[PDB]
Amino acid sequence: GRGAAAAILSLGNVLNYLDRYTVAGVLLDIQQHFGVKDRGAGLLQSVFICSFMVAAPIFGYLGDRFNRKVILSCGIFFWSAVTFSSSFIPQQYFWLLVLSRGLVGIGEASYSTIAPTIIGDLFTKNTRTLMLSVFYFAIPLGSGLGYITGSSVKQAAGDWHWALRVSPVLGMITGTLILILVPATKARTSWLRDMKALIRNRSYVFSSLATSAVSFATGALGMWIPLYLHRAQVVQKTAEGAKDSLIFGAITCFTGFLGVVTGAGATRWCRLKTQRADPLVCAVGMLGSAIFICLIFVAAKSSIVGAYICIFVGETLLFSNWAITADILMYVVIPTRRATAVALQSFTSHLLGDAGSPYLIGFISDLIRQSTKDSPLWEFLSLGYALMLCPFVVVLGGMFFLATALFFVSDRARAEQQVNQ
Structure with a gap:
């Protein structure tokens, strides 16, 4: 079976x-x-x-x-x-x-x-x-x-x-x-040598930092936005929070599928136009995702529906890169260093982001809430202010992907030379 x-x-x-x-x-x-x-x-x-x-x-x-x-x-x-x-x-x-x-x-x-x-x-x-x-x-x-x-x-x-x-x-x-x-x-020495040679791969490092920013964004958002939407409904007269989380998950699954599909399609279309299409499509998606992740907070007060469509599009964009980052890593790194490269990238993405990023957002929320008066309005505004940091990290990840695009061909050439020689 x-x-x-x-x-x-x-x-x-x-x-x-x-x-x-x-x-x-x-x-x-x-x-x-x-x-x-x-x-x-x-x-x-x-x-x-x-x-x-x-x-x-x-x-x-x-x-x-x-x-x-x-x-x-x-x-x-x-x-x-x-x-x-x-x-x-x-x-x-x-x-x-x-x-x-x-x-x-x-x-x-x-x-x-x-x-x-x-x-x-x-x-x-x-x-x-x-x-x-x-x-x-x-x-x-x-x-x-x-x-x-x-x-x-x-x-x-x-x-x-x-x-x-x-x-x-x-x-x-x-x-x-x-x-x-x-x-x-x-073969510990082999792993050490593989790491020592990987740090000198500029595209690999930049892509690792970009996916670390993506991890930061994903962790913070996916961990806090249900509570954020419930707070937005509380501060406004129309208050729910189970329904908010339900709708968020329903959008999340569909957005994940659609984002992966659209990332694959955009990659396939843009490769024919030019090489180094994967980093560039990733960076463009990151810019759009940052714009709409910042738009969610503006839309929250006016109406929850606009915030939900913003969630839809931002999740689509930020999720599309999940299938392209692996292809980027595969293209940059030679096979002798692929396992170590993947392990190090996963570790770094979990360290720089998604580990402490939710804690950092909560700490910021607590800082603003305690510095000011404590109330539903202030709690809502403080959570929104803390979540405001995620768009900046997404923009940083997009810039890192652009940098990776800059060094893409040279790193491919060095990889080919290492394999051939």
Whole structure:
């Protein structure tokens, strides 16, 4: 059952991202229950991403050294249990939830690092691109369903707690499948030398910084904008926040698919016009995404619908680059340094962005809110002001992509010379 194995792997990835983003949709309830501020809310995602980055390389090394299936299934079970246990935490305690988020990060890093290897080892033909395509499409759908399930479970059960209790169960079932169906899969100095040679690749460094900016934007936005929309509805007379998160997730999944598709199409069209089309299309998309991510805050007060269309277009643009960055990395770097290059790029993108970026946004929100008077209007304005920083980082990432475009051909030439000589 190789096809069933791929299907269950995709379902497990969906559940992985569902568990990752279930907290974002129910952030208001957690913050109100534990009596914490925006800083404490950020801590959750910040610690999760820190754990993910610190754990993924370990899990890759262990997967190539030890059985992949055992690690994958044990991870499924591990974060499922961690989530279901974190559902039960005394309101007085707060750090236990952060520890649970970190452990879920460990497990989800295990999965995100091992599952692609299994998907590849099951089968290597050109049809492998399609199977990996569905595996990766599990990502935006997973995030959208995370928001949807958070909102819906919170509304139906009557307590936010159950938002962390339904998802675990399914995971375990998926775990029971990942071992039943999937069959057995078919130099420190070298790593140091590869790194020492990668830092001198200007396009690689600039693309890494640009994707770090993208990580910053994605993390901050996807973690805060549900609460931001609820705050916007609160400050205005028409107040909802489950519906806001529901609509955000529904837009998120569709926007992820459409953004990937449009990025691929724009790449295919613009390559014929000129080489170095990937960095340039990425940078243009980043500029547009920054413009509309800044437009969301202006549209919030006037009406929520305009903010939602701004979300749509900005998500489309910022999401399109997700499929082009990998092609950029592949084109720049030679095969001897591709694995190390990818690992370093992932680590740097998680470090410079998506790790502490939600915490930084929450800290800024707290700073403005405490410096000024405390009230729904001030809280809304402070969250908007903090989120204002994300467009600047997106513009920085776009400039980095433009720089990468500048050095693109020369770096290709050096790579070709290294390969040939």
